[PDB]
Ligand binder design. Structure first.
Ligand code: SMN
Ligand code: SMN
Ligand code: MG
Ligand code: MG
Lengths: 361, 361
């Protein structure tokens, strides 16, 4: 009530952390996750937190540069996430905010909202006018094998209570995809939802061919069958597909979603908070998905996702893949295959000795 | 014939150069142009050259990082621009190549083609199976005023022989746009083509309103009336517009053009070699534009553009705006309002003392 807090500075650092569980692709395991950690100091005793997953270390320095540079021009500015977005939008209209820039802007938006929650002793979800209801979740893996992996899967379903599993495919031929899926369904029975993520690996005609073959296995969705930019190719797959098509982890801001929806690219979407424009963009897209009747899930950043899904009219699944555990004070918790938001703000605090250990520069 | 050259290293540096002529926007003049200069050393006594215009210094370091990092993984690799593109494509499929990354990849592609021309003593246009025919050009300004600017305009048309001028608008109200355009047409007579660039400043309904008012002035095109990502809004303007709609300077790679064309966003396109994916992407888009019967122009990078326009089936205009003069050995030449390609390769050589003077780090 007294006055709106204001930004006094912004800091970001790189870390390469160990994964709680290495996930293995066709070539090899990934056991390292490169992140960027963002702090937005305010004039009211609160520093806002957020992280980005950066995919490859090659992106660490640029992202740190961009976050810090953008943050600097913001010092002195009132902490109003809507007005700040509009400012960052005007600022990159010509250079363009798709890509690394876009991640910097979304990261900052998350940090902003996080500060606002802290400053109120509330979780963001309550700022957003909803509550931290538990959200059905699914557990995300690389290339699963039924024999070689029965162990970890039993755990996910029985202890953590996961009622849905995602695996990857596409790397090889149709035979491998099918065997992998035949195994999984046999092993897990009919009551577990199985999702298959092709990670953009196919072209539209090949996607159509594989999907027809996999339809007998009761899949919940096929994810990014073709390159993410190829919206017309997604729509073409979607049109012929007996299985719901999921995509969206790689699209940029509300406009990026508007054009994908206009093209009818997918049955389901799963925006990444890093790429859709933070909490502020997410909410915009939530309204679009409501109008288009499209079930909306999240792509990673499970901690913050849990704050927006409860106010997403078409909320679907929260993806669980944990990259930020080892550097958080309070890793993510799944209870009976659901995640519940944690306050205050986004519930993101750094385990500083953890950070110091893993920091790269 | 003996063996295909191979990459041995890649270097990039930042410079902020003075413009041959400061161009003034509504707020103020821009007299500084931030660039990144790219060298790709080969094992055959040739280093490939290319530059990027980086819009804002804030992008200088990230771009240098990205070019050098990407280049490093390429050392040892045979200098085959098609195979190299496909490699950089696989490498960023998940992180995404829109944005800064995309500029790094296009820059590298230009450098590659430049080396290939040098290594043959030829201009790239001849590598591409065409010839360095002169290309009609137009001269690009900021917010012009007829009284206050008659002087520089007389020069452009009379000495350099420019038969086409572009100015900016949108910053203010319709009244200002109209007066500015009424002045220009009165001053330059009916034989000079006038283009108006709104630089994404309007929304679709406002764009429609202004364009209807400006139609009496015989404009050649209206450029980016609305945000570049808003393809559906462009199509909506285009549908109602009596004046050709031009756009494309901000779209990403061939797929980005494919979706814009699929959406019917514009009557004309003008890809930026930095954003369309270098020479290799350009050529792809050239074929798309041919099929869609869309006149294709270039956005800046006038030196390299002059090498691809002669093999672009729907070649239209080459945009002249000079940023790289002060650091080139051979600035750009316009003769009788046309530009002709200069070899060998892309005809890009550094004036090294010039560079040393302007380099930023
Ligand atoms: O859907 C998903 O999570 C995958 O596409 C994915 C993307 C990026 C990192 C890990 C996994
Ligand atoms: O069409 C154009 O050249 C303008 O949009 C423009 C873009 C970027 C820098 C200068 C000018
Ligand atoms: Mg995915
Ligand atoms: Mg323009």
């Amino acid at each position: 009530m007294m006055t709106t807090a204001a930004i006094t500075g912004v800091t970001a650092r790189a870390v390469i952390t160990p994964m709680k569980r290495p996930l293995r692709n066709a070539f090899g395991v990934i056991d390292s996750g490169p992140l960027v950690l963002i702090d937005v100091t305010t004039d009211q005793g609160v520093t806002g937190h957020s992280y980005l997953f950066a995919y490859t270390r090659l992106a660490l320095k640029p992202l740190v540069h961009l976050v810090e540079d953008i943050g600097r021009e913001l010092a002195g500015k009132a902490l109003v996430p809507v007005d700040l977005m509009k400012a960052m939008d005007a600022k990159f209209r010509l250079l363009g905010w798709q890509g690394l820039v876009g991640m910097a802007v979304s990261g900052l938006d998350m940090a902003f909202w996080d500060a606002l929650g802290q400053l109120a002793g509330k979780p963001v979800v309550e700022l957003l006018g909803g509550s931290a209801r538990p959200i059905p979740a699914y557990d995300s893996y690389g290339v699963l094998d039924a024999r070689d992996d029965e162990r970890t899967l039993r755990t996910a379903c029985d202890e953590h209570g996961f009622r849905a599993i995602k695996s990857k495919g596409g790397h090889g031929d149709l035979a491998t995809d099918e065997a992998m899926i035949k195994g999984l369904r046999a092993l897990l029975g009919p009551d577990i939802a199985l999702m298959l993520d092709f990670n953009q690996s196919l072209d539209p005609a090949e996607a159509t061919r594989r999907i027809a073959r996999l339809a007998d296995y009761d899949l919940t969705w096929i994810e990014e069958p073709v390159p993410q930019e190829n919206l017309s190719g997604h729509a073409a797959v979607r049109e012929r597909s007996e299985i719901p098509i999921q995509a969206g982890e790689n699209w940029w801001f509300p406009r990026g979603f508007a054009e994908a929806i206009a093209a009818g690219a997918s049955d389901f979407i799963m925006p990444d908070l890093m790429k859709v424009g933070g909490i502020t963009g997410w909410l915009n897209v939530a309204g679009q998905a409501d109008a288009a009747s499209i079930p909306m899930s999240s792509h990673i950043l499970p901690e913050a996702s849990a704050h927006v899904l409860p106010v997403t009219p078409t909320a679907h699944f929260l993806e669980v893949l944990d990259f930020a555990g080892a550097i958080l004070t309070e890793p993510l918790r799944v209870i009976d295959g659901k995640v519940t938001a944690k306050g205050p703000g986004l519930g993101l605090a750094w385990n500083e000795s953890a950070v110091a250990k893993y920091q790269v520069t």
